[model samples]
Target chain A: MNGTEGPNFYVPFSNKTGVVRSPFEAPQYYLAEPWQFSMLAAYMFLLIMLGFPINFLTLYVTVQHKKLRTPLNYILLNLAVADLFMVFGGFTTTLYTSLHGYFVFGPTGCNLEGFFATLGGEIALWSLVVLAIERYVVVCKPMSNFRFGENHAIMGVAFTWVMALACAAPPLVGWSRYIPEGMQCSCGIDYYTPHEETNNESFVIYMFVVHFIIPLIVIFFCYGQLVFTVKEAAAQQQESATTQKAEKEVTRMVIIMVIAFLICWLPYAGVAFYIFTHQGSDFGPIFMTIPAFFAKTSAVYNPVIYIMMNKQFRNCMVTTLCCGK
Target chain B: MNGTEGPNFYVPFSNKTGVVRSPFEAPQYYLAEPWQFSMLAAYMFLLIMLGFPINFLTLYVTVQHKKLRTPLNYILLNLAVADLFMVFGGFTTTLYTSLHGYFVFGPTGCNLEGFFATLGGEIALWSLVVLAIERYVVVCKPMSNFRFGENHAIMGVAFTWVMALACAAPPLVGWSRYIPEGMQCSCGIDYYTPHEETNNESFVIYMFVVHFIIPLIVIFFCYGQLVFTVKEAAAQQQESATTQKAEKEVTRMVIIMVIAFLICWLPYAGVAFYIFTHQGSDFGPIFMTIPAFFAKTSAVYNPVIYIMMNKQFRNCMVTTLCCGK
Candidate 1:
């Protein structure tokens, strides 16, 4: 959903002519209503305005404030960087295409736009999955002496980036080449076109399983296990109210973060699944705009839930942004 | 500095037919370079992104915190609201016209766009004038029995709005009509057309004198007296280093703000003055893009210079935006 394909997606001329043209030069077939275009523009505008500053401030507060330099904050900071990159890569390009009524970026531009957006989305999802596991270990199995070190968190974040890059790399290497899909304004893996060399169906399903479904299962399972463990402990000795309350608060925080991440990205995945099964169907393109807009909003939901809602992070945010003196 | 006009400015077709079609339906004689159009889009994006949150927080902070309920802060809040309104009215419309390559809004749209942009600009400029006068009274004439009251400050803001409305109303009536001037993306008092009912030159000159020149003169004059009075007091009493340092700091703050305001707007005014003299010249349209961009940034500069830099206001801003609890 975050990717872009040119007008040639339906017409297989690129292979015939052996000339890759800029989507801007292609005849625009998909035209959104004036109101829809305006709404999309407004949505992208808000994302850039709202997302960039919040994420930048999150990065600033986490890095500059010594007291905030914890392993947990570091993971969230990685998410912030990913969100910022997603906006710059995905939504800004979306706005450009929407405004011009065509994609201006050529084949290479299309590839890179899809690559970066996919990479950002993958990294964001994996970061949260890792965080959820870490929280489960701390809360549900406190007796284990596995002290989560800062180096370990750093390595985990690095691993997520490396894996995301690997996932996003297949399209560029011709596994399922990037092209502008529905609305013609976004570049993504072409689930609508199945090529023998591209393996479009296989790759789309693989992304759904590895990136979307796996993260969903991990987040909910870990949190669900944590809840059951807390209940069992309460049944035994009834842990101190303050201790239980703090654990519950931490659990609720992660739950909110995971829920927000899922809510944003799930519709996008559903759209992809539909396109995979019903390729070349006219019913698909019309439904793609709203989901794509929703998917782009995933770039903004992290900091709003994590940093803005936490009291400790809020203090650091305040000190970094306003109380400089 | 803050207005728009359409292509029919120089050519008169409306009087012959006695019919006015929307500017979007009119024939577009001017088309900018693709890069120029892209640049204008980028400019509007940044203004909305950077300006809205800063001003919204400014409005939020002053109203939310009890201690910030001073007459001075109230004046700043009024300015924030006016800046927010200006961005919504001026730049959004600018983006709309630029993207479509013509004015989409017709006569009523043109009149409203011009009206609101003018009203917002007038209110913003007048708010600053009132702030300058207030600062002058507080600093230079402290012993003069002219105690500023909250009611008086409120009345001043109200008066600025009423006067701005009065100033923006002439175009809506028969005095001067709204039309797209350069690039056809903006609506302001028609600069290219002259009529017995609407003298374009006189109206533009009147706007320059009343909106631009008078406000500039008042601000500089008030701040100038404050500087001289502070210097005289320093020499006579050989004021303590702390007091002298504070006065210099205040002087520096006002200087930076006044200079930023001038730099953003002066080029725009100069450009307007140029078009007043050279309406039909080919050279004018090419020069309008950058100055128009520079002028639109005036909406964001006030909060950055005034509230963001002030310690007390920053504290309030930090609490409102970052510190939720």
Candidate 2:
């Protein structure tokens, strides 16, 4: 309260004014609204714990049901696998951080938590990328009968991990230390420190470039190209009845796909971008922390959104479970 | 130095009277003599550097020679591709670290170096596993005739990255920090002070478990089965003309493979293990400094050991390049 204005994180505060009255702040950042911070953690844990059963059930039903064994469904199952790890790992982390006040999972837990969390986010992100690509090819490049097969699903899931694993592996071996006990519950650095230059920052920057930036670029580019391709296809075949209906259906699908992608990922991407550039900068942790929690929770949100809106996934889930029953 | 030595790290020459000097002087784990440190760095630089051209050439040749474009080769190419980044990224890193101090490029450099270097190690490790499995299938379970082709290779590489990338992605976001500016050139922890449990020590533990332990388990289990399978096959067909010779050859190859892996990784693992169990352990920068450098340099050594050693790669290198001209 003495040094800065808005809110103080050190003391218990039920209101903004009370938060501002507190004096216990770290040198770099302050947590004015600690309760909101707690709330965020609560949300993260609650969602993951609840989502696990749903995701697990989905995975089990899909695996057992032959009708649900589409390439797309398989990819979703892999997403479930990654999300399971993310949810369990991340949920526990959120719970612990909430109780302990900082990311207190020893160094190993830190690395594991971060790795699983990133893996979850990435699986979700890349799953979207794969699904979009599969849809685009099927709808637009139909001549090949490009049925997204189980093998391709396996391959897609495999590729996502390869990308994610490559991105994740460095922090453990290199100086990028994520858990320094006694720090607040937020993931902290030990192996490397944050910096402006690429070379100087912690080994974790791989996350920014490989995990976030490059993938985001690919997603946008691929989807952008897809939108164009679908549009052109529609225009060329406007004269025929089946083609016109097909075009309308495809357009509607693409629109839903884009919306889904944007809704789930945009917040994540925006938060990630902000963290990369602005985290620990002038805006500081208070501004960045809640948003990050939300970004991480994006995984839970994704499958729910996909199942609800995407008819293919919805129908697959229904038919597969019905057949099993 | 005065304290009892922990597991793994064996400090060599410091004190019978020790107030710990530097990692350079750690008696527990001497990766090399201090004077030998630079030479080791230089050697690693060369070995890692070689991987680039060799891998690039492999990629080129594989593309050119359609018959040689077997699916297994694609996996090899991906391994090479991953290795390429490790080599060049590592070369520049060593060049910088050897030239500069702990952290010349700040946090960014540390992150990039760690990511690429670790990626190289994981990819190479997994590739070897894949190769070993493939060989085992051929020699032991010969009926499968798996024909590890382009698709198999693709799936293997893809899966490898999935594991690696998922693990690697989180640190970039929060698990770790980058080395701040105006500090040493070393790419290591920034937030971890000695006072905390989750500090640098936790990092040591994570690295040991995730990097050294888990991967090693996979290698041992897979390779052990392969070895058993090979031995059984050889015994069953002892009367066959080629059995004795082929058995001996396979034995030698397996030994070399294991030795090479141990040589490349042991020092780094040893140093990390030391860090985990020891409480007030610095082990001197010199002790780990050299070993860490080589841990990464070890990446380049694999291509040399695995590919260049192969008769085909050797012959191709000799005959394909400007031979007649």
Give a tens-digit lDDT track for model 2, residues A1-325: 2122221122212234443332221211244334344344444445745587678778777777665455656676777887777766666754554444444334455556666765565566666777667655655675654465656677777888887787555555654544421113545332212443323264555555656667667766766666554454444444445634544454455456556656655654464455445423333434444444444556565566555435445555654532531
- Assess candidate 1 and give its lDDT: 0.65
RMSD of each: 5.7, 22.3
| Native contacts present in candidate 1, fraction | 0.16
Q: In candidate 1, how many Å is residue A283 off? A: 2.4
Question: What TM-score applies to chain A of candidate 2?
Answer: 0.70
Clashes of each: 24, 81
- Give the DockQ (2 decimals) of all models: 0.27, 0.01
Highest-lDDT candidate:
1
i-RMS for every candidate = 3.9, 22.9
TM-score per prediction, in order, is 0.83, 0.40
Worst 10 residues of 1 chain B by lDDT: B1-10
Candidate 2 chain B: minimum summed lDDT over ten consecutive residues — where? Answer: B24-33
lDDT (Cα, tens digit) per residue for candidate 1, span A1-325: 2223444454322224444344456535334444455556566677777777667767767778888555777777777777766777667766766556565565656665686787887787788777777767767666656756776688888889889889988877666776666555667766555666667777777777777666777677786677665553334323646644545555677776777776787777677667667654245346765776577766566666665436666666655665463
lDDT of residue A168 for candidate 2: 57
